[PDB]
Curated annotation (Swiss-Prot):
Belongs to the Bcl-2 family. This is Induced myeloid leukemia cell differentiation protein Mcl-1. Interacts with HIF3A (via C-terminus domain). Interacts with BAD, BOK, BIK and BMF. Interacts with PMAIP1. Interacts with BBC3. Isoform 1 interacts with BAX, BAK1 and TPT1. Heterodimer of isoform 1 and isoform 2. Homodimers of isoform 1 or isoform 2 are not detected. Isoform 2 does not interact with pro-apoptotic BCL2-related proteins. Interacts with RTL10/BOP. Interacts with BCL2L11; may sequester BCL2L11 to prevent its pro-apoptotic activity. Interacts with GIMAP5 and HSPA8/HSC70; the interaction between HSPA8 and MCL1 is impaired in the absence of GIMAP5. The lineage of its organism: Eukaryota, Metazoa, Chordata, Craniata, Vertebrata. Changing residue 27 to R: Reduced ubiquitination. The chain holds residues 172 to 321 of 350 of the full protein. A motif (BH3) lies at residues 37-51. A motif (BH1) lies at residues 80-100. Cleaved by CASP3 during apoptosis. A motif (BH2) lies at residues 132-147. The gene is MCL1. Induction: Expression increases early during phorbol ester-induced differentiation along the monocyte/macrophage pathway in myeloid leukemia cell line ML-1. Rapidly up-regulated by CSF2 in ML-1 cells. Up-regulated by heat shock-induced differentiation. Expression increases early during retinoic acid-induced differentiation.
Amino acid sequence: GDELYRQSLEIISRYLREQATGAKDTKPMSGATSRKALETLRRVGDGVQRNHETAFQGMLRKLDIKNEDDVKSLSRVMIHVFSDGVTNWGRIVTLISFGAFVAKHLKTINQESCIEPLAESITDVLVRTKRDWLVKQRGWDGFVEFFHV
Ligand SMILES: Cc1cc(OCCCc2c(C(=O)O)[nH]c3cc(Cl)ccc23)cc(C)c1Cl
């Protein structure tokens, strides 16, 4: 995906590590288009883990994530849930927020090494399945606008 992929991997990766563990990545992060996306994501996102906790918990249970090898096998189930039907920014937040929910879990069991791979995985599925649509919304820029004020 090049630019779209590089940008999405940064937003999602930082958001997931931010979610499990505190704290920002101080490194400046080819655009402030990314900073604006992280913040929109940070605010619209924290609700979702709240509201869907039971369901999220159930899904994680089925998944059985213990190690890095398990994270590498999640793509098919991840595409399965994501690509059915209608696309919107809200569905994307849900893909990303679960990813953050899964990421928190990864930390608890001291597998924080797995988070980067989880992010790569999520970004692959997002850009592969929804690429054309995303380009149409202008990508991350379209995202911040859709949720603005
Ligand atoms: C990181 C990650 C994200 C995923 O998101 C799939 C699409 C979002 C979604 C949707 C959805 O967009 O229809 N419904 C969900 C329900 C639960 Cl319990 C969890 C996620 C969703 C799905 C999986 C399996 C994984 Cl591992």
